[PDB]
Design a protein around this ligand. Structure first.
Ligand SMILES: [Cl-]
Length: 76
């Protein structure tokens, strides 16, 4: 599997997450992808529900796991 682990996938950018943010609903996106996407739809997420970039936090644990993935990845 050269493929990116699914938990590190952003539903919007559809690749690797650079910085995980998590919604109150518990959904995980890449920060910059979500920000920009939410501007395009006008605070609606990819299933058309209301969402603001102000109501997300960085997902610290997962950010950390991503850094480790990145170590193993960029090794090859
Ligand atoms: Cl996790």
């Amino acid at each position: 599997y050269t493929e990116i682990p699914d938990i590190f996938l952003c539903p919007i950018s559809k690749t690797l997450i650079k910085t995980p943010v998590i919604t109150a609903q518990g959904k995980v996106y890449d920060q910059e992808a979500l920000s920009n996407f939410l501007i395009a739809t006008g605070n609606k997420d990819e299933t058309g529900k209301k969402l603001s970039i102000d109501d997300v936090v960085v997902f610290d644990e997962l950010y950390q796991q991503i850094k480790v993935y990145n170590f193993y990845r960029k090794r090859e």
